[PDB]
From a paper:
Carbamoyltransferases (CTases) catalyze carbamoylation, an important modification for the bioactivity of many secondary metabolites with pharmaceutical applications. GdmN and Asm21 contribute to O-carbamoylation at the C7 (S configuration) of geldanamycin and ansamitocins, respectively. CTases in class III, which modify secondary metabolites, adopt two nucleophilic half-reactions, the formation of carbamoyl-AMP derived from ATP, CP, and Mg2+ and the subsequent transfer of the carbamoyl group from carbamoyl-AMP to the secondary metabolites. GdmN forms a face-to-face homodimer through unusual C-terminal domains, a previously unknown functional form for CTases.
Unexpectedly, structural characterization revealed the appearance of three reaction intermediates at different stages, in which two different intermediates usually resided in different subunits of a single homodimer enzyme molecule. One of the three intermediates was the natural tetrahedral intermediate carbamoyl-AMP-1, which had been predicted, but not structurally characterized, in a CTase. Structural analysis of the carbamoyl-AMP-1 tetrahedral intermediate revealed the geometric structure of a natural tetrahedral intermediate in a carbamoylation process. The carbamoyl-AMP portion remained almost in the same position, while the formation of the C-O bond between the carbamoyl group and the oxygen atom of C-7 in 1 drove a slight shift of 1 towards carbamoyl-AMP. The capture of the tetrahedral intermediate implied that this catalytic reaction proceeds in a stepwise manner rather than in a concerted process. Another intermediate was 2, which was carbamoylated, but not cyclized, with AMP located adjacent to 2. In the GdmN/AMP/2 unit, the C-7 oxygen of 2 was 2.9 Å from the lateral chain of H27. The distance between the amine of the carbamoyl group and iron ion was 3.1 Å, while the distance was 2.7 Å in the GdmN/carbamoyl-AMP/1 subunit, representing the end of the carbamoylation reaction. The structural characterization of 2 revealed the conformation of ansamycin derivatives before the formation of the C7,9-cyclic carbinolamide group, which has not been observed in other studies.
Author numbering:
A (entry chain A), B (entry chain B): 1 to 674
Write the structure that this text describes.
């Protein structure tokens, strides 16, 4: 029994179903493969097309999933989609009324077109199953819990009719208990408030991280105007008819001005975040307290995008409402896609289920075999120096104790937003200066941002306060207090309020990552490491070996440990041996506006990526003429000939374009099949 | 007292407040001037910046209005803006939260800045008066009716808080009787339905045009699901949580699918438009039946953009609910901008009321003086031939009876959407072929819509059924039955139901134009002409002299009468003397897209207009090189020399671009200070 789990929109690699399709119209595209109830493969399309939280159809991810499972498309019994058919089709239909050129292709046609043109797979109509959205979330969250009965809570932006559903799960049966309509959405509330801090969709956990720096008292009475707790677990949010945003009109009237990009985070900003955080905590806990005592369950599964609010999860844990809590590593809409497969397998036959609580998120493609990895690292030889230690884990521990910041890339990539020892960046967790530098030099982001620790399972309760319910900590789902006599020891990973979004790694969770953390602690006294996602500010988590090295070279990381190979930057790297390649979304433009006295303006030259919210950059005329000659095979050095050779001026410009990922730079060839 | 009335957004000429600012965000920019209670001058900014229904700050409109009154900016006693401050500032705030790079400038600052920069006008805060939107509409509609008391009804898409408001008006006193909340919007219902017909904002008149071709019984039980008539002149529209459109989800669920660009109108589309129109007729007559009885009033003013529904107005006339009915020539938001002037004067000093009933929309800038116009037509010599008849109206009547189709440009331009004898295209109205001949050829549009008759006040009732109430017909506000006997006589101007959007011209509403239609009737026994707006498919009604000549040369009209001059296109006109200039929104682009095997793809060259819904055209490499060298002074022929001279190929390419108004082409210099 082999079932595919789908979610996302239906856009091709180089265009969107409608021009400039908005970034929130079916986001976080992914594919999941379940076999005999076990999740054997899952990857988000963002990892393969390098567009954070992409809406494009997860074609690549279906191809990679089938590969990991050793299956051909003809082997797939059923395909599940994470939304009912009428609903996605009504929203497609709306987009078409706004774009009269766009042909009327609805989701069934478009799914079948993409699979057949992209994989040579005529999918039979009888094998395509559409699924209620919060039902898909529920299966995902609950089946992987290792629990045979639980209260299941789903909160996200919105399914087809509800912003929240409450379920009773017993064995493999889900039974709806309650639902909350769309205009009461808490993910809608959080995203609306996020826009006031100069952020956008995808940034909600940055706002979460800012919250502890603020005082929730300043704006408590203001947020109080926007919601009302009612009897028997109910609540309302209070809308307006001015703008499609629940928060900004009231705050404007009270003198709050939205932050601008580039501007610092004032104390009123920090307090806004703090009150918003408190608001959602008050509502969800109000919900949960009710349905805890009403349904009689002592175990909770929390899912939906809101369950990535690890601060909220830490409060649920410490509330005494439950004895166990479980959160899926992908509780946002990629997880809903996985659950759509369970639900599809349920409607065509009986539901085979996992036999154990999900402990590892390490479910995407791998980096490659030993010999193809050595072969590809030889292709980067003009740019990198490679050592091959006897015991790479032992070496890396030593380098981490010496204050090196390491890139760490092993095995299959993590499903979901957190990195957990397979696409990580790690450093000594003890020096407070490691927070300030890794924020400013490495990940190149805001100074208030916290960093998450990983601790061995054996030493966890030596450092953190895991008391209360038993939560799963293999995926940094819970914010947890650092024990007060440890907060100075752990300067980098102890947040401003003495909490940390902790990861407890074990031999069973991640044998190798646990070996590294164990040895570091043998060497230093402190079995705890800083562990942040391996990606710069312009890309999702690195996936392939070429992704890893590109990110290593364009980030200020000291050394890279990839599959037992020690990689370091060469002194004088040779950029010219790299082969430029346009992304399907790369565009080159020469533009002239109007000028003085109705003249033509002076030429300018930009490179930009053709999706909603994609970056832009001015380029020099020499670089513009170079990039126009890109054939995907000529190296950068021979391309530069046509503009008088790769000057140092040109290399630096290319390099900065490379950092922002406007086009692929990587040696000739590729690593090959895996 | 001198009061300026403003409406529209705050964008400058070349950019918008936020990038690609939606075309519905405070549209139909305009400026009006009142002095001692009289409307001295009013021009929509669309005529001056040449963008249909523009949202941009009406700076040119204000320069034109001040000069028309012989006034410095400093002379003005108050400025009135057609929306409350906190509402426009809350919408601006919402735009700013979605574009975190936009500086936080709200309306009071933006208004002062556009005036300080654009007119050197240091506007003191004391003088800026924001106005309730539906109050603005009502003042405009009622003070020009020449009525001394009336029931005032405003229906539009929405103001700050309502979509419909009912007023009692006595002299200068406005008293509010009733409101209808935003989600009951009939403008909204209408505009929603228009998107299902392949059309968009500003195409509502076309949907009205199509509805008689259709049978409302088909989709009548369907629309009945979307609304309910309730007691006491109340109605409910029934929404949905699927999409921001009232109509599309339910119609998708029954198999109605929207038409696409360039698709012919099917019988389903025809019937849809018929049921839509019947519905808003039902609801609006249900509102009016109640408020006519409850207020007891015999007179009705009607305003807000829904009042530009000529067919609905005709049902109000033919209902026996009122004696008089009045509709202002600019009942859409440009009229709310004038009414904002009046309300500012009332809030400050006292409100001086306009003398009599408005009879003439001729309120814009004029073409120029006889010496100026003659001189500028001399600059146009390489392209036209000019006769100076002794009696132009006399000659023009002859050609009309001979069968020529005439451009007719006199005096000041009409305020509001209808051309009424000052920027018109006139023709014999008797031959049915004249429909397709003028629509589907010279103006290059669509021919399902009949044309509009202008009849003399004297013969008016010998041709049309003006019975029922006493409506004002000086602005084509009412659709009325064509008398059955004259139906065959008037083939060009009579619909499938026998009705006609009637202009009734009198010696007092417009002298020159009355003489013209009388004389034509003495020469033919039919004192009815066809009257359409002087504009092709890519422009609003022409304004300037150069506007009028440009439009004549890029359409297939036979003759042009402009201020007693008879203008025809030369045998071989010399394009090369024209000086091309960029419009502030013109962009010239060389694009390269992604290509096969990750290469740099296709080098296309494009000209486009940078605004929401602006046209785009591909250009040849030679045009690209030519256009990029436009400097605002050098002629087209001299510019063409840098690419081998103005071939017939290039001149056709350039001409086709001129038809679509990507550029200004006109002789060197201007007409001068008008
Ligand atoms: C993302 O962010 C937001 C999004 C939205 C709202 C908001 C935000 Cl923040 N929030 C806000 O607050 C908006 C603010 O308020 C505003 C822009 C107000 C503008 C000034 C106002 O336009 C007015 N005042 O209605 O203009 P008017 O000329 O008098 O009439 C025009 C009407 O008349 C009908 N109509 C004409 N001709 C005929 C005929 N021949 N037959 C039958 N119907 C006809 C037309 O069909 C049309 O509906 C509102 C309006 O309608 C817009 O649609 C044009 C609404 C569009 C809906 C939205 C933008 C969703
Ligand atoms: C202009 O057209 C619109 C606009 C809007 C709504 C709709 C339509 Cl048509 N109507 C819909 O039905 C949208 C549909 O359901 C979608 C896209 C569901 C996705 C999978 C949601 O993803 C989840 N599961 O959270 C996305 C969100 O909620 C998101 O916040 C991330 C908030 C979005 C608010 C929006 C997009 C306002
Ligand atoms: N850390 C967070 N806190 C609160 N809400 C969040 C958080 N992350 C995502 N969301 C909301 O979850 C919604 C998306 O959920 P989903 O459909 O599962 O992808 C959006 O409304 C997000 O704003
Ligand atoms: Fe969801
Ligand atoms: Fe209006």
């Amino acid at each position: 029994m082999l079932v595919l789990g789908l979610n996302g929109n239906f856009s091709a690699a180089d265009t969107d179903v409608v021009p400039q399709l908005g970034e929130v119209f079916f986001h976080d595209s992914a594919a999941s493969l379940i076999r005999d109830g076990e999740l054997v493969a899952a990857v988000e399309e963002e990892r393969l097309n390098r567009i954070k939280k992409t809406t494009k159809f997860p074609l690549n991810a279906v191809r990679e999933c089938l590969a990991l499972a050793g299956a051909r498309p003809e082997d797939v019994d059923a395909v599940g989609y994470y939304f009912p058919e009428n609903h996605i089709d009504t929203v497609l239909n709306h987009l078409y009324t706004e774009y009269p050129r766009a042909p009327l292709r609805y989701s069934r046609e478009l799914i079948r077109q993409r699979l057949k043109e992209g994989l040579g797979w005529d999918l039979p109509d009888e094998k395509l199953v559409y699924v209620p959205h919060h039902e898909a979330h529920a299966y995902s969250s609950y089946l992987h819990s290792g629990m045979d009965s639980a209260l299941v809570l789903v909160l996200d932006g919105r399914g087809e009719l509800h912003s929240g559903t409450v379920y009773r799960a017993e064995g493999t049966r889900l039974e709806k208990l309650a639902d909350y309509p769309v205009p009461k959405s808490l993910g809608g509330l959080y995203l609306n408030a996020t826009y006031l801090l100069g952020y956008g969709f995808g940034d909600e956990y940055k706002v979460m991280g800012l919250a502890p720096w603020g005082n929730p008292e300043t704006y408590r009475d203001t947020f109080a105007k926007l919601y009302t707790l009612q009897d028997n677990g109910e609540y309302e949010l209070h809308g307006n008819i001015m703008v499609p945003n629940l928060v900004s009109p009231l705050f404007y009237a009270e003198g709050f001005r939205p932050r601008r990009k580039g501007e610092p985070f004032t104390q009123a900003h920090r307090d806004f975040a703090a009150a918003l955080q408190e608001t959602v905590e008050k509502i969800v806990l109000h919900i949960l307290e009710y349905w805890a005592k009403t349904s009689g369950h002592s175990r909770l599964c929390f899912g939906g995008g809101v369950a990535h609010n690890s601060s909220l999860n830490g409060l649920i844990l410490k509330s005494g409402l439950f004895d166990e809590v479980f959160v899926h590593p992908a509780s946002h809409d990629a997880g809903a896609g996985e659950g759509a497969a369970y639900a599809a397998a349920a409607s065509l036959g009986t539901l085979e289920r996992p036999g154990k609580r999900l402990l590892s998120a390490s479910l995407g493609p791998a980096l490659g075999g030993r010999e193809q990895i050595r072969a590809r690292l030889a292709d980067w030889a003009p740019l990198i120096d490679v050592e091959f230690p006897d015991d790479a884990v032992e070496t890396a521990a030593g380098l981490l104790a010496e204050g090196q910041v390491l890139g760490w890339a092993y095995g299959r990539s993590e499903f979901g937003p957190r990195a957990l020892g397979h696409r990580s960046i790690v450093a000594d967790a003890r020096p407070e200066e490691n927070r300030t530098r890794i924020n400013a030099m490495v990940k190149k982001r805001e100074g208030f941002r916290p960093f998450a620790p990983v601790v061995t399972a054996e030493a966890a309760r030596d450092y953190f306060d895991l008391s209360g319910a038993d939560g799963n900590h293999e995926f940094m789902s819970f914010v947890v207090p650092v024990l007060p006599e440890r907060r100075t020891e752990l300067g980098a990973v102890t947040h401003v309020d003495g909490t940390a979004r902790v990861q407890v790694v074990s031999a069973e969770s991640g044998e190798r990552f646990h070996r590294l953390v164990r040895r570091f602690g043998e060497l230093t006294g402190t079995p705890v490491l800083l562990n942040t996602s391996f990606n710069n500010n312009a890309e999702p988590i690195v996936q392939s070996l070429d992704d890893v090295v590109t990110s290593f070279l364009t980030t200020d990381l000291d050394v890279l440990v990839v599959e037992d190979c020690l990689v370091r930057g060469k002194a004088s790297p040779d950029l010219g041996v790299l082969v430029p390649r346009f992304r399907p979304v790369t565009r080159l433009v020469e533009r002239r506006t109007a000028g003085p006295d109705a003249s033509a303006g002076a030429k300018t030259h930009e490179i930009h990526l053709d999706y909603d919210g994609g970056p832009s950059a001015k380029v020099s005329p020499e670089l513009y003429e170079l990039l126009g000659a890109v054939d995907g095979t000529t190296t950068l050095g021979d391309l530069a000939k046509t503009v008088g050779g790769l000057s140092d001026a040109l290399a630096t410009e290319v390099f900065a374009l490379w950092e922002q990922r406007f086009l692929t730079l990587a040696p000739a060839g590729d690593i090959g099949p895996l």
